[PDB]
Tab-separated table of C-alpha atoms in Angstrom:
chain	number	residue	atom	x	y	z
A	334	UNK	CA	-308.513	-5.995	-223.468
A	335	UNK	CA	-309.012	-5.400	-219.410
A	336	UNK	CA	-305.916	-6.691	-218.694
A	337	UNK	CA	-303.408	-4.500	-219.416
A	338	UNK	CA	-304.628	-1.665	-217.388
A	339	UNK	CA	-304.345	-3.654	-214.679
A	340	UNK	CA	-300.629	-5.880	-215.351
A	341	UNK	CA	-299.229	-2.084	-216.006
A	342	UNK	CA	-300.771	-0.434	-212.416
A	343	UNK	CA	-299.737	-4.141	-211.341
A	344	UNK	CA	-296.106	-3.981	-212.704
A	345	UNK	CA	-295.504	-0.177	-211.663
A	346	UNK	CA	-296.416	-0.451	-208.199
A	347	UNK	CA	-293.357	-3.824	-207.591
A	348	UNK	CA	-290.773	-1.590	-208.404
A	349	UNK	CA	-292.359	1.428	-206.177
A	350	UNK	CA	-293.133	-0.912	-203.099
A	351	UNK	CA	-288.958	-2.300	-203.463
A	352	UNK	CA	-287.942	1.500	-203.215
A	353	UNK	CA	-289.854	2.497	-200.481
A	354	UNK	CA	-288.821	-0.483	-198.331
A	355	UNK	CA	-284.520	0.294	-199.282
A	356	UNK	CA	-285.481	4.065	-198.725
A	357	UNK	CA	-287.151	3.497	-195.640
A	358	UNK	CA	-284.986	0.654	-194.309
A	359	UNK	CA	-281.755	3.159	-195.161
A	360	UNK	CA	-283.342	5.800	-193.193
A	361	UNK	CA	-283.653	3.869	-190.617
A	362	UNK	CA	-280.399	2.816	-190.332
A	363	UNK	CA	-279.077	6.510	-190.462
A	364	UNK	CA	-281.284	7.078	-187.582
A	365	UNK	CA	-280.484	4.510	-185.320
A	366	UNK	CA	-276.467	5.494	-186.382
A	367	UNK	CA	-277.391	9.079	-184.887
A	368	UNK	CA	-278.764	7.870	-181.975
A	369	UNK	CA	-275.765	5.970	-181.250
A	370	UNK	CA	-273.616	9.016	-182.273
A	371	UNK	CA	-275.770	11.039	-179.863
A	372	UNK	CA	-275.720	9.100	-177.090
A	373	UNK	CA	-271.458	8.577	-177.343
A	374	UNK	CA	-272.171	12.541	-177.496
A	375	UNK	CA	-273.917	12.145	-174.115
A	376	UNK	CA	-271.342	9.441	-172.592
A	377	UNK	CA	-268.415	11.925	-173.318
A	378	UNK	CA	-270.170	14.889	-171.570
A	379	UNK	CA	-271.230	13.158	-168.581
A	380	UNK	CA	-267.640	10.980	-168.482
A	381	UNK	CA	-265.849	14.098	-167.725
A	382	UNK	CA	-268.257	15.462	-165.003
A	383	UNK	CA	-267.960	12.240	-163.023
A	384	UNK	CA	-264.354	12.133	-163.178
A	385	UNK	CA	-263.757	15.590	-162.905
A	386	UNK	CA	-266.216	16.324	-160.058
A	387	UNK	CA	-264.270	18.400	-158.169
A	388	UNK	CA	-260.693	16.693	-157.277
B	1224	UNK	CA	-265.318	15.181	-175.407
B	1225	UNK	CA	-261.760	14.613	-176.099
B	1226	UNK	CA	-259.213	17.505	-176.325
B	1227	UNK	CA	-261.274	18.905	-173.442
B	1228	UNK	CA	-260.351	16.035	-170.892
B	1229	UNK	CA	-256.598	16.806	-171.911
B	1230	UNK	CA	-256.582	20.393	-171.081
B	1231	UNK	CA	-258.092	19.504	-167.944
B	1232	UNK	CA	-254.981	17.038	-167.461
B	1233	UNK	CA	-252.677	19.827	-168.671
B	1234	UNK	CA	-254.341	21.981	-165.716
B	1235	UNK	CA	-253.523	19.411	-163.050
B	1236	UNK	CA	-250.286	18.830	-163.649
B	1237	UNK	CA	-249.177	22.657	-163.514
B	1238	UNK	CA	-252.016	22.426	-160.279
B	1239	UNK	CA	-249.881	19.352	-158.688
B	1240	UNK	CA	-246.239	20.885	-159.559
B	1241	UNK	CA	-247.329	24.474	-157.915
B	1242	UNK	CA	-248.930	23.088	-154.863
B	1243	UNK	CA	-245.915	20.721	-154.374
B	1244	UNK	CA	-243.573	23.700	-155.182
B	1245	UNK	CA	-245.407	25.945	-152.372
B	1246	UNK	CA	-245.123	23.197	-150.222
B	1247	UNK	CA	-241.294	22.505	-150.281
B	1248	UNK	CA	-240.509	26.323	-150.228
B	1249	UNK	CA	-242.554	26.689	-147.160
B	1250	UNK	CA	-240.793	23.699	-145.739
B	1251	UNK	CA	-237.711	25.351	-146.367
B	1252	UNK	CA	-238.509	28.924	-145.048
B	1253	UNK	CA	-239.259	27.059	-141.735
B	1254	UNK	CA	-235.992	25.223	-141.836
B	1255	UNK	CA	-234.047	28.248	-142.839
B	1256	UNK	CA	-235.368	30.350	-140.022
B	1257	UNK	CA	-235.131	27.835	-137.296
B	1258	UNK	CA	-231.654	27.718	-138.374
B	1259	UNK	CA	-231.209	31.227	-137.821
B	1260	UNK	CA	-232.732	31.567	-134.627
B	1261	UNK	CA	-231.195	28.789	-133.054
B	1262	UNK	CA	-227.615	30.648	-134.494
B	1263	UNK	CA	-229.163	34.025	-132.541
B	1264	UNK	CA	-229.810	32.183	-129.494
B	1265	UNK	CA	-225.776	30.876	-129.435
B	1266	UNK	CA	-224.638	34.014	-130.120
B	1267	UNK	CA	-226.881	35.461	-127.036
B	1268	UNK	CA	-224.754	32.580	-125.204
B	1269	UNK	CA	-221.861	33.859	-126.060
B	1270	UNK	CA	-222.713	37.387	-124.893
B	1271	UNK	CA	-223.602	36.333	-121.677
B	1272	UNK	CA	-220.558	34.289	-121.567
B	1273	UNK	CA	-218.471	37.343	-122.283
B	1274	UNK	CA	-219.844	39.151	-119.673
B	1275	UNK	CA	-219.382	36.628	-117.006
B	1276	UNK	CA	-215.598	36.701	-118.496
B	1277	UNK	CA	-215.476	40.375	-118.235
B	1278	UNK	CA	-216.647	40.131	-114.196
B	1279	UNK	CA	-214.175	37.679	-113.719
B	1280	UNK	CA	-211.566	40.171	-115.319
């Protein structure tokens, strides 16, 4: 009857929404693991002007 | 980054060992010549002495 075209909608979209949050989530992570990377990136750089400086 | 700040090391230790290296030789120049000149100025001593020797001859 009117059910089922909405328990299959219903059942398709759990799956979807739990795969968007892990790909999302995972993303995220990556990102803030760059930004991290980045700014060591940055530390390094501006490490050896300050000791460096001119001696 | 990393092998950078070790070149850079590399560079001031042949930078340190030079400039110590011109230091000492320059040291020893002045040494060497004030030796020398104080070995001239005997000598000139010695002339002089000579000639008073000579006179006295």
């Amino acid at each position: 009857d009117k059910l089922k075209e909405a328990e299959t909608r219903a059942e398709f979209a759990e799956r979807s929404v739990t795969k968007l949050e892990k790909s999302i989530d995972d993303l995220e992570d990556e990102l803030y693991a760059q930004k991290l990377k980045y700014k060591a990136i940055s530390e390094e750089l501006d490490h050896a002007l300050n000791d460096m400086t001119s001696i | 980054m990393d092998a950078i700040k070790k070149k850079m090391q590399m560079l001031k230790l042949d930078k340190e060992n030079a400039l110590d290296r011109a230091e000492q030789a320059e040291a020893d120049k002045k040494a060497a010549e004030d030796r020398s000149k104080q070995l001239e100025d005997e000598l000139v001593s010695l002339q002089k002495k000579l000639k008073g020797t000579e006179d006295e001859l």
